[PDB]
Structure formats: structure tokens, C-alpha cells
Design a protein around this ligand. Structure first.
Ligand SMILES: [Ca+2]
Ligand SMILES: [Ca+2]
Ligand SMILES: [Ca+2]
Ligand SMILES: [Ca+2]
Ligand SMILES: [Ca+2]
Ligand SMILES: [Ca+2]
Ligand SMILES: [Ca+2]
Lengths: 153, 134, 153, 134
């Protein structure tokens, strides 16, 4: 797979693991000091059952896109969606919203694909088994600023 | 049988009267056990949480009004009824006769067409005393 | 369902599919070389209509037991019958005939259950749609050589 | 849907008839392409020798019977079919519009239980005309 993607999603998953606390049979997440940019990712936290315990943003369509089968192993997946749903996942002021505006006019039946990483953190003395799902919010279709063209001379 | 039909259908109609659809979710209030399903075949309400009974109800049975049979063992039929029900002594003899005995139980399905107030309800009623004790 | 039963009945069904030829608006089945054990199964072959095209053995009662609604999808069913009818499905020399003899004295009116498997083979260039039904001739009640007993100590 | 199922499954069954297991190895005698695998997930025979198609077949798809899709570009779908195949003029039009157009092809996986004759065969069948020309 793409290496930058692996670094970003796994890194974010691990980071959330370090910020999660378990108190009163409930998960909370610390907002850390000195965090310099907002990651273009959305994190979900599940227990061993598949019950959603913590969700970073309430996107009801995306939570349903996450298949129960995915939650049982460490792996990578993709969710195919449309341009109106991808604009949901990004802040209204993020500069990819303008890229999505230009996709809408060129072809509003344009499909967008989001990477999804699942990682399982085994139960430890003061924390149960946490399954963390991180979604990349910028679709693969818009990663690049240009497309190579094959010229022969 | 005529008598068994009157018993299971009347019981199914009684729960149709008691069922109320509010906030997009069923709400019932109050020798049979009754389960209620929706048009997709999902289970909306059960009179008692018995996981073996639920499973034995074949989902094809729900597409139609019809009368069926559900086979289980004497230990499960005995754990269906109250701990000091009248028929425990009768099922005790058939157990000491044959520990692995086979009980079968009658099952009525009936579909209630949708209405302004409430959607299609499919109601499944199990006779909790088997046909072996009749 | 039981995994041995699935493999037995589907395997036999596919086998019969490979051995079927369609000639002169009629089905025939090859008897293959080097066929070691004989499956303890009875196969029926039907056309898209529900008309019987080929039966492995003519057992009127069992052919009438195959409900026409079964023929419309791929699925597994069961036929509840009695000991005398089950003896009709097995060769007189097969060793479960003596198990059937021992049931017939232990309990007069014992019920026997046979598994049944329906698989549809779509029409191909040289063959119309074929619906094959395989019956397991050993009833489930006699599958096992013993019954576990729950001992506590 | 229904029409493509009859086509891809009929084809997969046809290759099951044509498959023979001799000397502990497979041998098949002879608009789709068919691949045949073993129980472990390894590929035992393919009707062509196209590396991108072989890879696009996700190894999880092999554990069950089911129907999938595989996406590739218009140039790879054009190179899949014969040089002067019927629908090349159609795909030439889609290239002239969008050089990098996206085509998607239907895939059918099917498992054939082991047998005295041969072991479990898993048979995968690609429709070589994409769903965009339907
Ligand atoms: Ca997806
Ligand atoms: Ca543009
Ligand atoms: Ca795509
Ligand atoms: Ca005995
Ligand atoms: Ca029985
Ligand atoms: Ca019975
Ligand atoms: Ca697509």
C-alpha cells in the first residue's frame, strides 16, 4: 500500500491509544498540549463486542460504512462514496472543499474513496481491548496536484 | 386441530390488540409464548427471551399465515414452563423413561396488514405444552 | 449445517452434473471408470419446469416427497419418514439395514430423517438448466455409533 | 444481477466438468476468463496469463461463494479482449473522451467440494466486457 497513508493512519491510531483513558467503565480521550495541526482523519474507538465507545465526529453514514467483519482483525480497507458525502467529512474551510467543488461541476457522479485502518490494542492491567479505526478524510482521488502524462520524443 | 387453532390464533389476535406503534418502535404491555416480527423478518418483541425457540422459527414461515411444528427435547420443554407447572410430573415420567425424548410444539403464524397507525405485524405463537401430552 | 453432509451431497450433485449428457432432447448419465465406493445417496435430475428427467432409483414415495417449491432455489431440506421406508432407500446388503432392524424392535414407530440438497446448474451452450436433487440415504438418526453421556465428577 | 449470474456460473461449472486431477496436479482441456485455485488460496490454472487480473482477485474472496467487482482502466480492458474484437470501437470512443476512464468487471467465485476424484476447487470467472457497456 501507499506508505504515507500507512504512516498517517497507524500513527494517528497509536496516538489516540496513548490519549485514551478508561474510567467509570467509559472511554475518554485527552486533548494534548502543543498539537500543531489538525490531522485530516476521523477516529472511532470500539470494544471487543463491536460497540462504538467513542467517535470523533458524528457522521452517521460513515459509522455504518465500517463493516463488523473489519473490526475482528488488524487491516486496511476502503469506503467508496460520493462527493457530497466526502464534503461532510472535511471542515467547511479546508482547501480540499474547493477541489471537491471543481469535481462536482466536471462530473457530480464522481466516486471518492477513503482509506480506513483498523488496529487492535490488547487488554492491559488498567484498560480493556481497544479497537481503533482511523479514516483518512481526503479521498485518494484528490491526493495529487497533477496527473503524469506519457510523452514520447 | 380445531381447538388448538382457536387457542393460538385468539392469543395472536389478543397481542395484536395490545401492540402499540409509537416513536417508530413496537410496545406491547400486559400456556403460550408469543413473538412479534416485522415485514423484513426481524424480531421486534418477544414474550420471553428463549434463544432456542427463536431460532427454530424458520424465517420462511413468516412470509405466510400458516401452522407449523417445532421439535425439541424434554429438558427444554420442561424449562419452557413454570418451575411448579402442572405438567412437570408428566414430563418427569417421560424423562425417567427416555432422557433423550422428543417433544414437538405447535406454532401459528399470522400476518396483520399495515394501517395508518401501524405497519405490517407478523405474530408467531408457540403452544408451550407439546402435542405428546394431549 | 453439518459439514460432512454439505460436502457429501453437493459433491455428489456436481459429480452428476459432470456425468450428464443431453442428447436427442433427453438426459443420460455416464458411469465413470475407477469409481471406488458408491455414495450412499440417491440423485434425481429435473428440468426448469419441475419435470423429472432422470432418477437414479424409482422410489415413488421419495419422488413425491420432493416438494415442487424446493426445486426453485438452491437449498437444503429434510424428509421425515419411518423405518420401513428408509430400508427401501438402502441396498439389502448395506450394514445399516441391521441398525434399522435394531430400531424396529426398540421402537416400533421410530421416525427417520433424510437430508436433501437442491442445486441449479444454469443453461450452457450444450445443456439446458439442470436442477439436481441428492438425497442422503442414511438417516440422521443413525449417523453416529454412540451418544455422549454427561458425567459430572 | 440475474443475467450475468447465469453466464459466469454456467461458465465456472463448465470448467469444473473440464477439470481433471491426474498425478496430483490439475489439467483443463479446451467473453470471460476463468481461473482455478486450491483450498490454500494458490492458483493452479488460468485461461490467460494476465498479471493485473490475477492480482485484483482478492484472496479473501476465495473463502466463500460470492459476486464481486474489479476496477481497471480503459486501456487494460481493451488489451484484455482480442485485437479486432467487436467492442474495441466502443472502448476507443471512451478513450477519446477520457484517456484514463474507469472500467469495472464483474467477478464470480465458486467452491466445488472435494470428491474421491479431486479435491476442493475454487473457480473464479471474470466478465471481460465491463458493466459500462451494458
Ligand atoms: Ca467499501
Ligand atoms: Ca477540470
Ligand atoms: Ca474508482
Ligand atoms: Ca438399543
Ligand atoms: Ca424427530
Ligand atoms: Ca415428528
Ligand atoms: Ca466504480
Amino acid at each position: 500500500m501507499d506508505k504515507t497513508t500507512f504512516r498517517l493512519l497507524r500513527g494517528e491510531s497509536n496516538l489516540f491509544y496513548t490519549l485514551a483513558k478508561w474510567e467509570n467503565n467509559k472511554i475518554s480521550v485527552e486533548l494534548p498540549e502543543n498539537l500543531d495541526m489538525q490531522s485530516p482523519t476521523m477516529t472511532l474507538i470500539y470494544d471487543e463486542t463491536g460497540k462504538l465507545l467513542w467517535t470523533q465526529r458524528n457522521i452517521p453514514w460513515l459509522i455504518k460504512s465500517i463493516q463488523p467483519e473489519w473490526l475482528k482483525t488488524n487491516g486496511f480497507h476502503e469506503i467508496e462514496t460520493n462527493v457530497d458525502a466526502t464534503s461532510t467529512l472535511l471542515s467547511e474551510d479546508h482547501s480540499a472543499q474547493e477541489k471537491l467543488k471543481e469535481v462536482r461541476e466536471d462530473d457530480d457522479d464522481a466516486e471518492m474513496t477513503h482509506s480506513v485502518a483498523v488496529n487492535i490494542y490488547p487488554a492491559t492491567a488498567r484498560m480493556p481491548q481497544l479497537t481503533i479505526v482511523v479514516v483518512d478524510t481526503i479521498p485518494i482521488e484528490l491526493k495529487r496536484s497533477y496527473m503524469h502524462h506519457h510523452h514520447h520524443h
